Design an enzyme around this catalytic site. Sequence first.
Site, PDB file in Angstrom:
ATOM      1  N   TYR A  72      42.148  34.517  41.910  1.00  0.00           N
ATOM      2  CA  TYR A  72      40.825  34.550  42.471  1.00  0.00           C
ATOM      3  C   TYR A  72      39.744  34.619  41.414  1.00  0.00           C
ATOM      4  O   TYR A  72      38.554  34.539  41.755  1.00  0.00           O
ATOM      5  CB  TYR A  72      40.657  35.770  43.383  1.00  0.00           C
ATOM      6  CG  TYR A  72      40.920  37.056  42.698  1.00  0.00           C
ATOM      7  CD1 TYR A  72      39.932  37.629  41.893  1.00  0.00           C
ATOM      8  CD2 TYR A  72      42.161  37.711  42.782  1.00  0.00           C
ATOM      9  CE1 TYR A  72      40.210  38.804  41.155  1.00  0.00           C
ATOM     10  CE2 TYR A  72      42.427  38.860  42.053  1.00  0.00           C
ATOM     11  CZ  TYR A  72      41.408  39.409  41.270  1.00  0.00           C
ATOM     12  OH  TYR A  72      41.638  40.606  40.583  1.00  0.00           O
ATOM     13  N   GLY A  73      40.118  34.840  40.159  1.00  0.00           N
ATOM     14  CA  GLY A  73      39.178  35.197  39.095  1.00  0.00           C
ATOM     15  C   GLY A  73      39.177  34.221  37.952  1.00  0.00           C
ATOM     16  O   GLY A  73      39.076  32.993  38.140  1.00  0.00           O
ATOM     17  N   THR A  74      39.294  34.788  36.729  1.00  0.00           N
ATOM     18  CA  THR A  74      39.180  33.946  35.539  1.00  0.00           C
ATOM     19  C   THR A  74      40.353  33.027  35.283  1.00  0.00           C
ATOM     20  O   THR A  74      40.282  32.152  34.402  1.00  0.00           O
ATOM     21  CB  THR A  74      38.977  34.812  34.271  1.00  0.00           C
ATOM     22  OG1 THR A  74      40.181  35.512  33.945  1.00  0.00           O
ATOM     23  CG2 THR A  74      37.788  35.743  34.371  1.00  0.00           C
ATOM     24  N   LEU A  75      41.427  33.152  36.070  1.00  0.00           N
ATOM     25  CA  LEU A  75      42.598  32.268  35.926  1.00  0.00           C
ATOM     26  C   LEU A  75      42.485  30.984  36.750  1.00  0.00           C
ATOM     27  O   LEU A  75      43.331  30.088  36.554  1.00  0.00           O
ATOM     28  CB  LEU A  75      43.879  33.016  36.351  1.00  0.00           C
ATOM     29  CG  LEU A  75      44.265  34.218  35.481  1.00  0.00           C
ATOM     30  CD1 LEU A  75      45.371  35.073  36.160  1.00  0.00           C
ATOM     31  CD2 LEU A  75      44.713  33.769  34.096  1.00  0.00           C
ATOM     32  N   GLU A  84      46.862  41.227  32.464  1.00  0.00           N
ATOM     33  CA  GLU A  84      46.063  42.002  33.370  1.00  0.00           C
ATOM     34  C   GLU A  84      46.179  43.513  33.110  1.00  0.00           C
ATOM     35  O   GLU A  84      45.684  44.350  33.910  1.00  0.00           O
ATOM     36  CB  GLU A  84      46.495  41.730  34.829  1.00  0.00           C
ATOM     37  CG  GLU A  84      46.235  40.321  35.267  1.00  0.00           C
ATOM     38  CD  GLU A  84      44.787  40.130  35.620  1.00  0.00           C
ATOM     39  OE1 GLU A  84      44.444  40.547  36.764  1.00  0.00           O
ATOM     40  OE2 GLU A  84      43.960  39.732  34.831  1.00  0.00           O
TER      41      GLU A  84
END
Length: 144
Positions: free
Chosen positions: A7-10, A82
Amino acid sequence: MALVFVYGTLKRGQPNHRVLRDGAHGSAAFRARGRTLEPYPLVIAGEHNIPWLLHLPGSGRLVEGEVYAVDERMLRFLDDFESCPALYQRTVLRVQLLEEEPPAPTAVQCFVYSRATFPPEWAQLPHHDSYDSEGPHGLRYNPR
């Protein structure tokens, strides 16, 4: 394979997407465009403008993201990427697949990186349905 919902920087187009495509880390294959079935608060917080999926299911918004099929190498990599369990924890949730008789399943369980312990005021920060470092908020991801 294990499935991870990112959902993020990946995500594709986001600043850390490359770590999924670095074969030293194992393998990650795009499987589906998804949206969480349950809402969570997804907030940009801290000096680095990191996106945090706060582990408060039932509040926030439904979150857009991408489902990847990952091998065990890549899952172990991502756990450390993470900073689990101290920063994030790997939890599970159900994701709606975004695309006749019997009809196609429309849900899949995935792993996700959520955060259980956080400054409580973070829960009142703006809630995001779709994170983008370069999004309209201006709070670009700042790892430096």
